Tab-separated table of C-alpha atoms and ligand atoms in Angstrom:
chain	number	residue	atom	x	y	z
A	1	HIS	CA	127.100	121.457	58.718
A	2	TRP	CA	127.125	124.156	55.987
A	3	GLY	CA	129.006	127.362	56.406
A	4	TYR	CA	131.494	129.573	54.614
A	5	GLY	CA	134.771	127.474	54.709
A	6	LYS	CA	137.027	125.361	52.392
A	7	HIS	CA	135.383	122.084	53.595
A	8	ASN	CA	131.759	123.471	54.213
A	9	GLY	CA	131.437	126.598	52.067
A	10	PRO	CA	129.523	127.410	48.946
A	11	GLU	CA	131.230	124.799	46.555
A	12	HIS	CA	130.092	122.052	48.977
A	13	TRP	CA	126.449	123.084	49.441
A	14	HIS	CA	125.142	121.192	46.513
A	15	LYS	CA	125.760	117.822	48.284
A	16	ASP	CA	123.122	118.582	50.954
A	17	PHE	CA	121.095	120.976	48.823
A	18	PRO	CA	121.182	119.883	45.192
A	19	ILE	CA	119.045	122.843	44.310
A	20	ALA	CA	122.418	124.755	44.457
A	21	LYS	CA	122.959	123.829	40.810
A	22	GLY	CA	119.361	124.832	39.791
A	23	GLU	CA	118.016	127.117	37.134
A	24	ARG	CA	117.365	130.241	39.194
A	25	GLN	CA	120.110	130.496	41.790
A	26	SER	CA	121.313	133.686	43.495
A	27	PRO	CA	123.297	135.837	43.657
A	28	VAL	CA	124.283	136.835	40.092
A	29	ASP	CA	126.517	139.320	38.409
A	30	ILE	CA	124.400	142.253	37.139
A	31	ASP	CA	125.866	143.087	33.740
A	32	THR	CA	124.493	146.710	33.519
A	33	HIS	CA	124.782	146.963	29.772
A	34	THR	CA	122.701	143.801	29.177
A	35	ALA	CA	120.001	144.561	31.761
A	36	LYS	CA	116.779	145.554	30.020
A	37	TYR	CA	115.199	149.055	30.995
A	38	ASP	CA	111.493	147.985	31.431
A	39	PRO	CA	109.183	150.952	31.245
A	40	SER	CA	106.354	148.621	32.621
A	41	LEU	CA	108.154	148.316	36.013
A	42	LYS	CA	106.665	150.520	38.776
A	43	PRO	CA	108.360	152.553	41.453
A	44	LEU	CA	109.146	150.423	44.316
A	45	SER	CA	106.890	151.178	47.385
A	46	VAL	CA	108.715	150.709	50.596
A	47	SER	CA	106.366	151.434	53.636
A	48	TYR	CA	108.344	151.008	56.748
A	49	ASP	CA	106.662	153.682	58.959
A	50	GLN	CA	105.186	151.119	61.346
A	51	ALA	CA	107.963	148.613	61.454
A	52	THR	CA	108.348	146.872	64.804
A	53	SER	CA	111.714	145.495	65.301
A	54	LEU	CA	111.850	143.049	68.111
A	55	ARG	CA	115.176	141.134	68.469
A	56	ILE	CA	118.711	140.987	66.962
A	57	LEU	CA	120.130	137.506	66.624
A	58	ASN	CA	123.565	135.831	65.926
A	59	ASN	CA	122.495	132.777	64.099
A	60	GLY	CA	126.104	131.736	63.359
A	61	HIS	CA	126.084	132.659	59.602
A	62	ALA	CA	125.213	136.319	60.025
A	63	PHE	CA	123.043	138.409	62.398
A	64	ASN	CA	119.321	138.936	61.888
A	65	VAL	CA	117.300	142.031	62.939
A	66	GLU	CA	113.717	140.529	63.373
A	67	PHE	CA	110.461	142.094	62.972
A	68	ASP	CA	106.986	141.419	64.198
A	69	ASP	CA	105.356	140.302	61.002
A	70	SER	CA	101.918	139.304	62.624
A	71	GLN	CA	100.189	142.561	61.335
A	72	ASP	CA	100.304	144.476	58.116
A	73	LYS	CA	103.189	146.960	59.171
A	74	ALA	CA	106.406	147.129	57.114
A	75	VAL	CA	105.553	146.214	53.598
A	76	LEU	CA	107.151	146.154	50.146
A	77	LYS	CA	104.986	146.447	47.062
A	78	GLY	CA	105.056	147.840	43.551
A	79	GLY	CA	108.255	147.553	41.626
A	80	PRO	CA	108.027	144.242	39.839
A	81	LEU	CA	105.780	142.751	42.497
A	82	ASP	CA	102.114	141.710	42.389
A	83	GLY	CA	100.709	142.015	45.871
A	84	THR	CA	102.173	142.886	49.166
A	85	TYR	CA	105.186	141.464	50.949
A	86	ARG	CA	105.751	141.976	54.595
A	87	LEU	CA	109.219	142.430	56.254
A	88	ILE	CA	110.337	139.567	58.486
A	89	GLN	CA	114.099	140.219	58.977
A	90	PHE	CA	117.202	141.819	57.609
A	91	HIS	CA	120.796	140.749	57.672
A	92	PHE	CA	124.081	141.457	55.911
A	93	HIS	CA	126.868	139.658	54.109
A	94	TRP	CA	130.374	141.100	54.297
A	95	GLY	CA	134.018	140.516	53.657
A	96	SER	CA	137.326	140.166	55.458
A	97	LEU	CA	138.533	143.237	53.403
A	98	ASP	CA	136.740	146.165	51.898
A	99	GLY	CA	137.240	144.785	48.367
A	100	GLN	CA	134.857	141.889	48.884
A	101	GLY	CA	131.728	140.950	50.749
A	102	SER	CA	128.718	141.548	48.494
A	103	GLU	CA	126.793	138.604	46.979
A	104	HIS	CA	125.512	140.385	43.917
A	105	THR	CA	128.153	142.079	41.772
A	106	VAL	CA	127.719	144.957	39.276
A	107	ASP	CA	129.841	144.502	36.118
A	108	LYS	CA	131.951	142.177	38.316
A	109	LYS	CA	132.440	144.892	40.997
A	110	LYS	CA	132.303	143.609	44.519
A	111	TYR	CA	131.037	145.856	47.261
A	112	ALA	CA	132.250	145.686	50.891
A	113	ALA	CA	128.903	144.276	52.057
A	114	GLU	CA	125.275	143.758	51.089
A	115	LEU	CA	122.103	144.272	53.150
A	116	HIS	CA	119.156	141.925	52.545
A	117	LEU	CA	115.653	143.000	53.712
A	118	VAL	CA	113.584	139.798	53.498
A	119	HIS	CA	109.851	139.971	52.878
A	120	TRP	CA	107.200	137.268	52.361
A	121	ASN	CA	104.111	137.376	50.141
A	122	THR	CA	101.012	137.805	52.305
A	123	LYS	CA	98.974	135.680	49.926
A	124	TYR	CA	100.758	132.572	51.483
A	125	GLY	CA	99.946	133.463	55.073
A	126	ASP	CA	103.386	132.926	56.659
A	127	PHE	CA	107.086	132.764	55.761
A	128	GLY	CA	107.353	128.970	55.938
A	129	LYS	CA	104.589	128.471	53.343
A	130	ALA	CA	105.906	131.367	51.228
A	131	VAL	CA	109.322	129.810	50.703
A	132	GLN	CA	107.667	126.868	48.980
A	133	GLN	CA	106.335	129.142	46.250
A	134	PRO	CA	108.105	130.658	43.190
A	135	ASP	CA	106.748	134.149	44.120
A	136	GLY	CA	106.942	133.639	47.870
A	137	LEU	CA	109.663	136.138	48.878
A	138	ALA	CA	110.929	139.546	47.819
A	139	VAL	CA	114.410	140.547	48.952
A	140	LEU	CA	115.501	144.141	48.770
A	141	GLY	CA	119.286	144.127	48.344
A	142	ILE	CA	121.376	147.181	49.102
A	143	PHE	CA	125.140	147.468	48.559
A	144	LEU	CA	127.459	148.961	51.178
A	145	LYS	CA	130.658	150.801	50.343
A	146	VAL	CA	133.183	152.098	52.914
A	147	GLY	CA	133.347	155.885	53.273
A	148	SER	CA	131.236	158.184	55.491
A	149	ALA	CA	129.343	156.529	58.357
A	150	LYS	CA	125.667	155.585	58.048
A	151	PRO	CA	124.143	157.097	61.224
A	152	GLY	CA	121.098	154.882	61.017
A	153	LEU	CA	123.327	151.855	61.170
A	154	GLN	CA	125.072	152.757	64.434
A	155	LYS	CA	122.346	151.234	66.736
A	156	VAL	CA	122.968	147.849	65.049
A	157	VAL	CA	126.716	148.150	65.357
A	158	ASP	CA	126.631	149.087	68.989
A	159	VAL	CA	124.617	145.978	69.974
A	160	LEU	CA	126.969	143.585	68.262
A	161	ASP	CA	129.269	143.120	71.192
A	162	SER	CA	126.183	141.604	73.093
A	163	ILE	CA	125.692	139.043	70.399
A	164	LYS	CA	129.233	138.084	69.645
A	165	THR	CA	128.826	134.463	69.429
A	166	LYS	CA	126.432	132.071	67.731
A	167	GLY	CA	123.150	131.727	69.536
A	168	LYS	CA	123.104	135.140	71.298
A	169	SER	CA	120.140	137.444	71.059
A	170	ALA	CA	119.273	140.853	72.369
A	171	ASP	CA	116.118	142.984	72.565
A	172	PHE	CA	116.180	145.242	69.686
A	173	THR	CA	113.111	147.259	69.615
A	174	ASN	CA	112.323	150.607	67.913
A	175	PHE	CA	114.914	150.096	65.198
A	176	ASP	CA	113.842	151.932	62.088
A	177	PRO	CA	115.079	150.266	58.861
A	178	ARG	CA	114.268	153.431	56.861
A	179	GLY	CA	117.681	154.694	58.179
A	180	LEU	CA	119.428	151.985	56.026
A	181	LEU	CA	118.057	153.065	52.689
A	182	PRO	CA	119.820	155.130	50.001
A	183	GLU	CA	118.223	158.205	48.454
A	184	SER	CA	117.249	156.559	45.195
A	185	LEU	CA	114.989	153.503	44.792
A	186	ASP	CA	116.136	152.808	41.256
A	187	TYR	CA	116.690	149.017	41.003
A	188	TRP	CA	117.429	145.891	39.028
A	189	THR	CA	115.209	142.850	39.373
A	190	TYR	CA	115.335	139.157	38.450
A	191	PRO	CA	113.905	135.810	39.682
A	192	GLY	CA	116.257	133.910	41.984
A	193	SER	CA	116.738	132.063	45.243
A	194	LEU	CA	117.775	132.269	48.805
A	195	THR	CA	121.607	132.700	48.816
A	196	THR	CA	121.976	130.461	51.874
A	197	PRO	CA	120.868	126.851	52.291
A	198	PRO	CA	118.207	125.634	51.701
A	199	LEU	CA	118.709	127.723	48.521
A	200	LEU	CA	114.973	127.636	47.676
A	201	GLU	CA	113.972	129.184	44.364
A	202	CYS	CA	111.312	131.478	45.806
A	203	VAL	CA	112.743	134.974	45.612
A	204	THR	CA	112.056	138.020	43.472
A	205	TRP	CA	115.286	139.959	43.890
A	206	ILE	CA	115.174	143.777	43.890
A	207	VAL	CA	118.735	145.165	44.013
A	208	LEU	CA	119.118	148.926	44.436
A	209	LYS	CA	121.412	150.697	42.122
A	210	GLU	CA	122.665	153.311	44.772
A	211	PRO	CA	124.893	151.915	47.539
A	212	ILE	CA	124.862	153.210	51.065
A	213	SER	CA	128.085	154.357	52.674
A	214	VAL	CA	129.215	152.965	56.021
A	215	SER	CA	132.405	153.831	57.851
A	216	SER	CA	135.476	151.693	58.197
A	217	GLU	CA	134.766	151.591	61.922
A	218	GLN	CA	131.218	150.316	61.364
A	219	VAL	CA	132.276	147.394	59.071
A	220	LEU	CA	135.207	146.602	61.382
A	221	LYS	CA	132.625	145.924	64.145
A	222	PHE	CA	130.796	143.453	61.851
A	223	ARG	CA	134.117	141.688	61.411
A	224	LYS	CA	134.557	141.194	65.214
A	225	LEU	CA	131.527	138.921	65.312
A	226	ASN	CA	132.102	135.266	65.574
A	227	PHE	CA	130.758	132.256	63.728
A	228	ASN	CA	131.465	130.066	66.704
A	229	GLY	CA	129.475	129.802	70.003
A	230	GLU	CA	130.682	130.928	73.373
A	231	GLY	CA	133.467	128.854	74.793
A	232	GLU	CA	134.620	127.628	71.451
A	233	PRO	CA	137.784	128.697	69.405
A	234	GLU	CA	137.502	131.921	67.614
A	235	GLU	CA	136.538	131.987	63.896
A	236	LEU	CA	135.786	135.565	62.910
A	237	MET	CA	132.448	136.034	61.048
A	238	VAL	CA	133.881	137.379	57.738
A	239	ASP	CA	133.389	136.393	54.122
A	240	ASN	CA	129.852	135.113	54.744
A	241	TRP	CA	128.897	135.597	51.059
A	242	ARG	CA	128.006	133.208	48.310
A	243	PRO	CA	129.724	133.998	44.905
A	244	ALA	CA	127.787	134.891	41.758
A	245	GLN	CA	126.000	131.893	40.145
A	246	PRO	CA	125.186	131.219	36.518
A	247	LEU	CA	122.427	133.432	35.109
A	248	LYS	CA	121.085	130.576	32.872
A	249	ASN	CA	117.830	131.438	31.307
A	250	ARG	CA	117.140	134.706	33.029
A	251	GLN	CA	116.756	138.396	32.170
A	252	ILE	CA	117.703	141.172	34.617
A	253	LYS	CA	115.416	144.186	34.225
A	254	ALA	CA	116.212	147.762	35.146
A	255	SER	CA	113.704	150.247	36.529
A	256	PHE	CA	115.715	153.167	35.162
A	257	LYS	CA	117.245	154.408	31.974
B	1	ENN	C1	118.455	128.860	57.580
B	1	ENN	C2	118.806	130.432	57.636
B	1	ENN	C3	120.303	130.573	57.305
B	1	ENN	C4	120.602	132.065	57.154
B	1	ENN	N1	119.803	132.667	56.037
B	1	ENN	C5	118.778	133.420	56.184
B	1	ENN	O1	118.457	133.881	57.360
B	1	ENN	C6	118.074	133.867	55.015
B	1	ENN	C7	118.752	134.420	53.927
B	1	ENN	C8	118.058	134.919	52.811
B	1	ENN	S1	118.931	135.766	51.527
B	1	ENN	N2	120.468	135.729	51.905
B	1	ENN	O2	118.681	135.028	50.311
B	1	ENN	O3	118.415	137.110	51.605
B	1	ENN	C9	116.657	134.747	52.786
B	1	ENN	CL1	115.726	135.320	51.451
B	1	ENN	C10	115.968	134.176	53.845
B	1	ENN	C11	116.691	133.741	54.949
B	1	ENN	CL2	115.850	132.845	56.108
B	2	ZN	ZN1	121.267	137.390	52.535
């Protein structure tokens, strides 16, 4: 089955998911000189005051912090979006070293990791219907660099030992995702896809310009996770990122600048 290796990693995905070679795949390199400042773009509105985190889960590709998305609670709007998009989960992608790990790149720079806050368009009623639509999802992407710790990250890191292996889940209530955001909401945006199989071309990407800083110790705990399940040989969960894909006929827009 797909994963991040030589025999089942990103260069193999297209055999099961031919959409991998499509016209609006993610991630991309954000060439900052070529991105268009669009004065028509709005501030992004991130309303996470009532977010209800529920569970943290090791799905075997990354970990997901899940939210109760059955009410209008944690929503993304504005920016390039029409409508309202409700938060369902976040997860990260990260490297084996600090010099790699992000999916998007900025003038070919790789960050140590990238946070994805996944939201679905309420006009489609649920996530599963949204992913079948070209405007179904909005992903807020945030780069991580290694430096000073991110205090609002520590609750996530400290639960990771309880979800080491694939399949594990732990109650994870009262986690506030506002503690993962940078100061600025300046962003780039473009139409793209999920970066994991099934690679559906349903995402408006919103990538923040300002990274957050996390400590070496915090990203070292992400790298202790395992891609395998309990009782199977250890394969550390590192380098769970898909490389930049061809931009093809797309324009990246800047909200700033
Ligand atoms: C079958 C699930 C395999 C793991 N991937 C995800 O959880 C996932 C990743 C993105 S990403 N990496 O594009 O943000 C999105 Cl938008 C939506 C989901 Cl569902
Ligand atoms: Zn992701």
